[model samples]
Target chain A: HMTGPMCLIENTNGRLMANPEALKILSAITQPMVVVAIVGLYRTGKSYLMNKLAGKKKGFSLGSTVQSHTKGIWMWCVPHPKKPGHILVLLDTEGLGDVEKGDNQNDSWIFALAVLLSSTFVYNSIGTINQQAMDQLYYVTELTHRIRSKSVSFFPDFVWTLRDFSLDLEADGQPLTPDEYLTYSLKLKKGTSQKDETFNLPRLCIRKFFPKKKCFVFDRPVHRRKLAQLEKLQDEELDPEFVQQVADFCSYIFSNSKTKTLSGGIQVNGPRLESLVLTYVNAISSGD
Target chain B: HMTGPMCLIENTNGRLMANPEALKILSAITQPMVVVAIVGLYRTGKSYLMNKLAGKKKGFSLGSTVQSHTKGIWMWCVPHPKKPGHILVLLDTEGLGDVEKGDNQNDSWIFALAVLLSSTFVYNSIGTINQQAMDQLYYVTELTHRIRSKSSVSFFPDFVWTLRDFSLDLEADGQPLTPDEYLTYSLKLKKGTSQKDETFNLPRLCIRKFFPKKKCFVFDRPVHRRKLAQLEKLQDEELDPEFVQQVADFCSYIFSNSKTKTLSGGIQVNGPRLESLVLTYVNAISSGDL
Candidate 1:
């Protein structure tokens, strides 16, 4: 019998290797598991949102300080409460842009790996979907180049999870949805460089890389900001709008999110998942 | 031509995975690298001491916050400058007893992995060694059981116990305790307590029992708590010059003492073997086999 959350890779300081228990869980995943990974800048409530997605009051440990709480990749295998015979593997990642250990080079690899490993990659960011936010996602462009050179097709559906999005739902007086905002944001070049080559690559990559994508705009949960303890916070305390948005998001995810494997754009059964993880971990570790 | 320190695993937010660049370097290490790993509690200046061992002013990044600096295991491979035809692999691990994360269970795996993997394992600690300190190292006892259960004779590496902030000189008898005496003192349980039947089945394994070779070093506190910035300055002005010489002597001794598969049975493990060991250990933990 399996128990508790499994840390996939126990990163004792800097050595990033597989967690033995996590490997066991990975090997035991009898059915095809849906991999939903969340990535974003540090201290941005990425883990908080993941806990909500997991449907547990206190599943993933939330950080008290402004510093990052999650270290390395952590996976929780739970039988999908709604869907039978399917396991939901939730991947919680450490946030990027950590001020303490400020290594953007390392951050870039993390971004690439998270996106590569997940079938549905959730990018958590505060504020509206703008050029600035898009600029931060320039790593995708770099990854696109890597995948192209390696001849590996990375087709994970990019889910732009926009947190605290307060902008009016209108563009040029026309009713604009979050999807349109993402499409508009994707085309815009936020780079300050004079070089056209720099701008062109990301634009082309975003267009071709994530053929399938979705956008979700969430209102700021008023209770979350002011309070430290969330495990006991009641649904009544949360903003009604935020609650409704979460319900819709959860439902949409269960209905739509497809199972992903190490093989690009393909899904596999449980036994092969072990191989996929090994292959992916080795490939990413070796910088292939 | 490895230029600088490579982050083997990087965790942002909570997602931790192997750094691609670090792996590339690991795969490239064709020579039998001598792995020197450091382990201890958090915020004890583990990285600071490692930087000194690496012979660089700012090799590993030091944290300014109260939080632990190194998250996952980090590796810095430099050509053994003095000893040719050898690669020196410096593994700087995250300190234990992290208040922020508060995961001692996870930290135990790190201690086990670092001890199992290294050719020469350095246990860093502050103040004097006592039963309290040895109790903190109860993880070694757990690791002993793990190695025995695995049935494969764990070619235990050389254990170098580094004591920081030494004030006393020699013993009460006016003679310094040899390394053997120190080990005996460390293993001697200060408190007399009743033992369980199951506990009696396994002998109270002393660390020296696993790691046959042992060495001890006494070091004065390098930097004063009042002056944080003084660390960047030359030790000739702020610190005792003898302290500097001691550090140099220790570094030289470590370089010379390292041997290939110097663990019991002379089991030689190269780069690929090390990688394979990591994979196997991880797999075992996952499967609950170890």
Candidate 2:
């Protein structure tokens, strides 16, 4: 049976209609070495995202429920068509958000080590933004803070490049400005403390994930804009109410000053450099 | 059952001993990061060694034979008695060496990497002789080779040390050779290979493993021993039939000669290091020779 994130599109026909001007989108399934390690509690679209990323509608998505509080590390390599030489190793970890049920204490190291060793970390983000993302970073922070502080910095490049942002958000009751969306996202940022000094990491945004998919009634700039808003839309239309509500909610959460105080002057969201996010980092100070 | 080649040795005695020598030995066991990785195929003493090394008479010996091979890596730490600050870590690898019937091909790197990336490699050997004794070295060779070849060679140091030798062979035979036995053993050495070229590694007698109870027999040098039959042994002992037989056999196998016409039109053993004799290598190079 086919499975993964519910909205992910499946192409089972195995037929490609080529277009010279248009770039053909190959399934991640074709990637020989791209592996997306899905980490988090059960049913968190880890399997789904993995399948979607791998472009393998058939492989990589099926698995039994995690017996313990979390799933152990399973590395899956996916191949790509365009960049045939590179490999992408994916790690699937369990949900840390399940505070009531999960064991975030011990399992965090498994994830951190996976990141320290892997080529890239594919941190998942559903529409449901929560402190869970921060927990993932915290795992890296706590473990590598003393031994490998630098490489554990900026991570989990957002999947904004893949989101079909051509859809409009005006239809949603929360129709928020792009400025408010960015501001709110920064506000929602999470901070972790180490050696009595709280350090903050900004969310990663990759523009490629938000490529234009289809024409919509909204302004072109709106669809092409930043990472904060493009997700709540379909190919041609918008879930205006949901988008607006989400935007307003994010703005309010980020705008609130509570995060800064809790961070003890450490910022929840601050400056972010695109190059810094994309460039690889060494976890250990003395590393290559 | 106890699993993995490395494990933590714990003393279960309710009452502690006060004897300094006994305490020293006991403390040595208690201290140092002693890791025992259970290696080899399913029945070849992988788990047996784990249990024996761990001193777990019953536990960790035959814990389980699940398909997963082993549950995961096990860790234990002991403190040194003599050295107030030094500590030792004990790690046990699930299994390797038996990849045909097992999944060692994929997992061998797992445990090898754990050690290579972290601490130095410490081997326990009894005698350098025997195929089984060289098993660990073969794996270590591959791992060291890979580490040296990897892109990050600059970051990691390459030094592997062997610890005390513990051999099933010695236990099966007798208390391992004493110092005099080892000294005599070393003295009565038969070369594995003889090379006229200086660059070629002289095939000296080498046992893959070391004998732990070596201090038992000490060698008292007769200051001018080499002058007398190279100071090795008396003529009677050197001419012993058994000694000749052992040397002859060792020479026959490890350094057997092959015929080839030299520039002067002569034949001799191919005087090169014996290439590794894996079946594949055998097929490629020695098909006709075989």
Candidate 3:
């Protein structure tokens, strides 16, 4: 019944604190939730994809310039189009970190919060799966220290979405799928050197945790000058390929992403989701 | 009334962390400080030079093997013999990034800490000033982004490049050059758009633009190769005369010129101010700022 996304986390100066407005809304819902959150660097057209997932033309705000429009995470809850008796929770997270002070390190906590709160966590990037992509997600390696859970595999299904992808997906002259490309990129190199361990860590972490891994490669949604008003542009006006890709992505997410649940196998209700958000933000506040 | 060097900052696994016990010692001191910190690659006899600067023979621990003996920044505070009111706070920082750490990513934090904390920063190396030494100090190029303050150059510590076991004559173009001129010579710009040229110029540009002053010293090899293991045990008379003289010159220069640590706004840092600065930087460094 929500019209659009509301601020789930608000920026206090540079600090990220959970918003009470969203929690009060959450406190009203009684349905189980299928939370999907997107995280990545700034100005990569991440909010566009979240809007598509929300099945709307305009919900989350997209930026017109190089500066990031999204500072803290925004949340949208809708009736699950695929699963009856389920509420779909879509979160659009801040790109990089809070721009208020320009301390770029706290993106790790955003990544951490998405994992802690959602059933399906998506990482958005702007290039092919390569060393730089792996290095940027070096944040994945720090999750071991960030989350103090007993079981290592208690994380959400990880979906790596690469935007503006314009590469031939081939290895050994054999055609590959997006998931295959991610798997190939995550493959570890052979060596025992210190450099080897450092290079191997991110791959090792992705393989061990987040058991369900998915990948999606998207072409540009529209021409460069058109991105500023991306929300206003109709699906017919958008790149046909990008529109179709968005359709395919949403259906897959709707059909696959399950209700948010505890490791104890109990499905999380609206109040339960609100409680989980409080717990993670409290932890971050204490550490900060 | 200090006995010896204590750990100012200790490594918690790979973290460049501050030790509470050392912070407790720092809390009691009320005197303004002339904080001097030395940084270099591992097992390059950096600790030996810091021990010399401390006016003691056996304070900062010297390694007997290939591994770095210092895990984090070690602190030694002593009364300045030349300046009556000021305390000479010497910090011996870790040699490399962490032993497990491979690249320059983590190395930049220690260098940033040295710049952010010290009134005088000494760069230690084992050979003549060359591209190799500059290459090893690539962390210098990263300070502009790391420090994230206005007028970054004005905030840097005075640059000192101390060459250990240096064997080359400080001369070029058949003219006897001072160590300072030799450094300037080595840093002279080379032209091209190639990747090699960028690597060569980056550190040089930062070094010239940032530091308030520059000084260089090429120390004579202190003892024979065989006597190196027994270096701490050997007397000054047993060492090479030139080596002894270089140590004295180094000491005299440091004592005569090093200023008390201060903020960019001319706020003089006493013990608590320095302590607060360390914690601010430690938290910044620890919380994933790259």
True-structure lDDT of candidate 1 = 0.64
Model 3: residues with Cα > 4 Å off, grouped in runs: A97-100, A130-132, A149-153, A191-194, A224-226, B1-290
Query: Which pairs in model 3 have colliding backbones?
Result: none
lDDT, candidate 3, A85-163, per-residue tens: 8999999988763222233446677767776888898888654443433555666546634664422344678888977
Worst 10 contiguous positions by lDDT, candidate 3 chain B: B96-105
- Write model 2 residue lDDT over B114-230, tens digit each, in one string: 333222332322112222223333454455445434422121212222211111122112345532343333223333344322111112122123211121211111121111112
Q: Candidate 1: list runs displaced more than 4 Å.
A: A1-3, A130-133, A144-154, A188-200, A223-225, A262-266, B1-290
Candidate 3: what lDDT?
0.73
What interface Cα RMSD is found for model 1?
Answer: 21.5
- Displacement of residue A119 (Cα, Å) in model 1 is 0.6
TM-score of chain A of each: 0.86, 0.41, 0.91
* lDDT agreement with native, every candidate: 0.64, 0.29, 0.73
* Number of the top-ranking candidate, with lDDT as the measure: 3
Which DockQ-derived CAPRI band holds candidate 2? incorrect
Scored against the native two-chain complex, candidate 1 gets a DockQ of 0.01
Best-first order by TM-score: 3, 1, 2
